[PDB]
Ligand binder design. Sequence first.
Ligand SMILES: [Ca+2]
Lengths: 149, 86
Amino acid sequence: ISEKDRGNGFFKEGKYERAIECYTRGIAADGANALLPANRAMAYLKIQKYEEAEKDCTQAILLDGSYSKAFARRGTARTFLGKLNEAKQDFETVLLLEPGNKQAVTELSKIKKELIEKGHWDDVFLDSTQRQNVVKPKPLKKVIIEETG
Amino acid sequence: SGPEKPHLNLWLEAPDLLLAEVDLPKLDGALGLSLEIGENRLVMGQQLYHLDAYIPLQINSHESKAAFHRKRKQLMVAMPLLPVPS
Ligand SMILES: [Ca+2]
């Protein structure tokens, strides 16, 4: 009977817009619960409403500052919106709340590579946390050296 | 006299991403600087600096990129790793 439980039913059946109605009704009847906005952000993702999904995730994060799944959904949403550096900061937060989260490790590689491809070297090299994973030191390949800063 | 071996920083930013940081203070500008990356080797070559290092990891040379930071006088390398054997 819970408006969230009723919304989850439509969600399993792939009826995404009808689950949002239930999630909206559940939000307007319980603004403190962080499950409802995160659930509605997940349904927004299923219909490529990435802008609307980011706000629903931030609302959930404000309510619960440790909601790992909320950072995850905002991370994918921010990638589709192009906010790569902001997406990287979310998935690295997940990696702190859930060390070894496989979705986080995968999406972090895919993001940190596209950031370097676009030239945002400092966003990767300066904000890096894994600097302690030291690595102590056949045709060759000439790699051109662009500039930055 | 001769070319000096610079200071190198290596770490795993990701399981399949290896990052490098070479300090080149006496150097300025990417012009006249060459970088060669093999499967297990890193060659940085004007003859002010020279660095011939061996890396214990499988480097994807084709998809590797580099950049000389002018403010910090550093050469930054991004070396994606090749898929490991099953
Ligand atoms: Ca709060």
